[PDB]
């Protein structure tokens, strides 16, 4: 079972700045701008480039103790970031691997658009839990909004 979902969120931060902060410098912001959702992000292998394995540890009381995202592509010129949840988190009997892509497209009005493409690999003939999709959407939204607030409050951070 391979299931594809697409979302298109918006932001008021310029695309270059938002990619520089939200995607590139996400290890130093997510545990700082949204500590109520992510306890700590740490590259347990690699340094952020392709093949990096980021372990994301959540605070107490969340359903999952940690997730591991295998960073696959980071295109700085087109602001593209392809990673893959491979271990921990929602990946048990049902799921196997969640291939995610985030592309930050600059809008003419000055903001930016996050085009997010997720692809779940359910084992056998299992369905994607709607609660899992909702939780992933909520986590993405809270991280994006927290980074957006960090960039709005600190107008000089990341150019």
């Amino acid at each position, epitope marked *: 079972g391979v299931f594809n979902y697409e979302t298109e969120t918006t932001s008021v931060i310029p695309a270059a700045r938002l990619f520089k902060a939200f995607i590139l410098d996400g290890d130093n912001l997510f545990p700082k701008v*949204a*500590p109520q959702a992510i306890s700590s992000v740490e590259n347990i292998e690699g340094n952020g480039g392709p093949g990096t394995i980021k372990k994301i540890s959540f605070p107490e009381g969340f359903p999952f103790k940690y997730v591991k995202d295998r960073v696959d592509e980071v295109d700085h010129t087109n602001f593209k970031y392809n990673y893959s949840v491979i271990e921990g988190g929602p990946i048990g009997d049902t799921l196997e691997k969640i291939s995610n892509e985030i592309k930050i497209v600059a809008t003419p009005d000055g903001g930016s658009i996050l085009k997010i493409s997720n692809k779940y690999h359910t084992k056998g003939d299992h369905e994607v839990k709607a609660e899992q999709v909702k939780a992933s959407k909520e986590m993405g*939204e*809270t991280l994006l909004r927290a980074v957006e607030s*960090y960039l709005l*409050a600190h107008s000089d951070a990341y150019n």
Partner: antibody
């Protein structure tokens, strides 16, 4: 800049729907997490909840069962709907705008007296 | 639900003496604490965010410090407008719980 104020009724009968409505002005609606907080002498300041500028609601666990924080970007106007209010929901309700680090801008605050 | 305690319950100081307020968290939060100064009859105003930093427009006399389950706010030579209630807010765990507050009176 970014001055914001409520437009809710200050007298609510018990076991009814408390409805506050905060109106923003002088700034973009897409700047803060729009927050509802209440100050009560018996419990001090308490986070009712907040919402991002796109439907991203986080509610207090002790209030998530009977709280809905809605937003309307077209008129720059968000609102708190607390159904089944008991006598312990009387407080001074502040609508506010919070950055990631804390509540940056505040409202006047309306005294809501439940158990009319 | 992290229960923050604040000490002392109330401190009365002269208009110009240095004031020290302590916030103790129940769980071990990181350096995520915000200090608010609610005047008697107004909305609270943020003073120190992330337990050390200071937003623009706040006078430099306020200084935050601390980490873990121990934070301190110091008001060096407080003015007459600093006789208010001071709350500490943790943001390391939703819900963001405030503190009981510490009223600052005028010594006499």
């Amino acid at each position: 800049q970014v001055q914001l104020q409520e437009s809710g009724p200050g007298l609510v009968k018990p076991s009814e729907t408390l409805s506050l409505t905060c109106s923003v002005s002088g700034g973009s609606i897409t700047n803060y997490f729009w927050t509802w907080i209440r100050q009560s002498p018996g419990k001090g300041l308490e986070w009712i909840g907040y919402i991002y500028y796109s439907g991203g609601t986080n509610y207090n666990p002790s209030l998530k069962s009977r709280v809905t924080i809605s937003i309307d970007t077209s008129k720059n106007q968000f609102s708190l709907n607390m159904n089944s209010v008991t006598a312990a929901d009387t407080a001074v309700y502040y609508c506010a705008g919070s950055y990631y680090y804390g509540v940056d801008v505040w409202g006047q605050g309306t005294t809501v007296t439940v158990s009319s | 639900e992290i229960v923050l305690t604040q000490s002392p319950a109330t401190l009365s100081l002269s208009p110009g003496e240095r004031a020290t307020l302590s916030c103790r968290a129940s769980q071990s939060i990181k350096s995520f604490l915000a200090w608010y100064r609610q005047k008697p009859g107004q909305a609270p105003r943020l003073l120190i965010y992330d337990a050390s930093n200071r937003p623009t427009g706040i006078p430099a006399r306020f200084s935050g410090s601390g980490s873990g389950t121990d934070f301190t706010l110091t008001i060096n030579s407080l003015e007459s407008e600093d006789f208010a209630v001071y709350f500490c807010q943790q943001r390391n765990n939703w819900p963001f719980t405030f503190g009981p507050g510490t009223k600052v009176d005028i010594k006499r």
